[PDB]
């Protein structure tokens, strides 16, 4: 697909940041190496459900004033194409497949089959969690349902699973045409307190490490590489300075389009014609 690393990072960082900040022992583990007073002051101010201060995330160049006490500024950077395929063919498909998804589901009995229901039509099934079927189990997929023989499996009549699958758009042939790009985004934790900037740096590094395992950047946005700048005053001529430490996140990812092929051939036919010269 076409991709937007900045909007991915914003969407991914915001919930993760919230869920760490609402959970005191995570911060208590992340900041174990800092000075005791720095740790306790940060945990008192920003952390837990009762926290009176708050962190914020957003893109650069807003028209309004931000929470300069603690704010992650996201800042889309450079990139370049790095590797190309022969014919620019990144892949080919017989059935137009959408995004990868993971969904929780439960088995139910139906007509002496077990079935799992999924919210969308299954374009491909990658994994039913914790199950490997035998041929006897007569595994079949149909529409948005996975179906599974009941006879030997009655103990599992309400078994709970996670389905990893991917959507289908439509039944069509085509070529995925495109290339790989290596692209940079900068993130900086702004604070007018230097110890807050240093803690926001630690929290962001933890978040990015945790992010490396996510399906989003396992399937796309691969090879996350991190670089770190000096701590410096970002703005120097207010009533106080604003400090930050930049980090650069670099990703390798595919830019591509679905070139559908309308041509289809369903019968050869043969004829002999005679040359009398």
């Amino acid at each position: 697909a076409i991709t937007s690393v900045d909007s991915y990072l914003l969407s991914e960082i915001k919930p993760r940041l919230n869920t760490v900040l609402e959970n005191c022992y995570i911060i208590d583990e992340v900041l174990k190496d800092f000075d005791y007073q720095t740790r306790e002051s940060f945990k008192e101010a920003f952390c837990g459900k009762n926290a009176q201060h708050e962190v914020t995330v957003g893109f650069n160049f807003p028209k309004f004033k931000n929470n300069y006490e603690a704010h992650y500024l996201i800042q889309l950077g450079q990139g370049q194409e790095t590797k190309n395929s022969l014919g620019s063919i990144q892949s080919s498909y017989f059935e137009a497949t959408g995004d990868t998804l993971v969904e929780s589901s439960t088995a139910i009995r139906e007509d002496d089959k077990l079935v799992f229901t999924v919210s969308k039509p299954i374009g491909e099934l990658i994994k039913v969690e914790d199950i490997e079927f035998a041929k006897y189990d007569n595994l079949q997929v149909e529409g948005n349902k996975v179906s599974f023989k009941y006879q030997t499996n009655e103990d599992y009549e309400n078994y709970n699973a996670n389905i990893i699958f991917t959507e289908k758009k439509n039944d069509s042939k085509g070529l995925v045409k495109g290339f790989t790009v290596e692209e940079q985004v900068t993130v900086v934790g702004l604070s007018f307190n230097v110890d807050v900037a240093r803690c926001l740096d630690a929290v962001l590094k933890m978040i990015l490490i945790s992010m490396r395992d996510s399906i989003e950047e396992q399937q796309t946005f691969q090879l996350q590489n991190l670089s770190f700048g000096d701590i410096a005053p970002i703005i120097e001529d207010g009533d106080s300075m604003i400090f930050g430490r930049p980090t650069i996140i670099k990703y390798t990812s595919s830019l591509d389009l679905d070139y559908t092929i309308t041509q289809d051939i369903n019968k050869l036919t043969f004829k002999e014609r005679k040359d009398w010269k």
Partner: protein, 49 residues
């Protein structure tokens, strides 16, 4: 002359807050005596400026 021409102001005197971290040297961000500024202020004084 100054009392005629100046506006009434409240003046409060700066001092460094004793909440500064004894190692890092930076203010505690949760300090109630100073709201994350390194500088605490004495009670206000009425003056004209």
């Amino acid at each position: 002359f100054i009392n005629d021409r100046g506006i009434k102001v409240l003046w409060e005197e700066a001092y460094f807050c004793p909440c500064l971290n004894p190692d890092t040297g930076h203010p505690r961000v949760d300090c109630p005596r100073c709201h994350g500024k390194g500088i605490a202020y004495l009670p206000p004084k009425e003056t004209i400026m």
